[PDB]
């Protein structure tokens with residue numbers, strides 16, 4: 019009950035900042051997550067024995083892929099931690115509990131292939147789940163791990179609180195399907211501008227939590243340039259593997275996934291910052307003013323990609 023996790027001084031200070039990198043020491047990431055749960059939620063939210071057994075089972079069910087791995091899971095949870103810590107009073111006890119777990123679980127059992135590749139391969143998961151294929155799977159795997167003996171970190175919730183938290187986690191994980199982000203942000207944009215945005219309206223909270231999930235999921239574009247640049251290699255290593263597998267099914271991949279068109283990457287990143295990342299952090303900054311550092315860092319990285327194109331690096 020009185021057992022805190024304490025980090026070294028540099029981590030203790032930097033973990034509060036949006037641009038924190040969890041570092042290359044895998045064995046510290048579980049402790050970093052528990053630390054964040056304790057300060058975000060409380061030391062009483064979860065039985066430590068049960069939380070630790072849940073964390074290690076989640077870790078085991080992330081695969082050894084270049085990007086959609088255990089490090090991505092903990093990175094996305096840290097961004098959620100930073101958003102929640104800078105917006106103390108806007109979120110309920112259940113929401114703080116639910117969203118850190120949703121973030122840690124959001125890409126469970128990812129193989130490093132898009133929903134598109136599953137559909138064109140005719141993967142069984144594509145028959146079981148026609149839309150948000152991987153994301154329905156990630157939610158499935160999360161429930162499976164929650165129902166392992168000793169792994170039910172929510173067992174102290176009432177019946178109805180339990181149903182609410184699993185429903186927060188399901189919507190949170192489904193929302194990480196980027197195909198759903200475009201319409202969600204358009205709607206949040208209209209609502210904020212016409213002044214109809216109302217955070218006591220559950221359907222409006224759902225939408226805002228969805229955008230928070232997109233913002234955390236993309237948070238590698240909000241790091242210091244050397245982290246963003248090196249993470250971009252990992253993301254493109256999966257894209258190029260998927261492009262190779264498209265070619266094996268006799269389909270020319272989109273240029274983003276074609277390893278023969280590496281030269282077009284800087285311009286592809288521009289498109290992605292302008293069409294996805296900047297709009298995402300703009301609308302988020304409009305709804306939650308203290309998340310502005312994510313937008314500032316994202317713009318800095320847009321500028322760095324412009325410099326790559328202009329041959330200045």
Ligand SMILES: Cc1nc2ccc(Cl)cc2nc1C
Nearest residue numbers: 236238239246249250253290
């Ligand atoms: C979709 C997408 N997601 C990303 C997430 C993180 C980083 Cl560094 C780069 C990314 N590039 C693209 C194209």
Ligand SMILES: [Mg+2]
Nearest residue numbers: 124125152194
């Ligand atoms: Mg995902």
Ligand SMILES: [Zn+2]
Nearest residue numbers: 124125194235
């Ligand atoms: Zn993800």
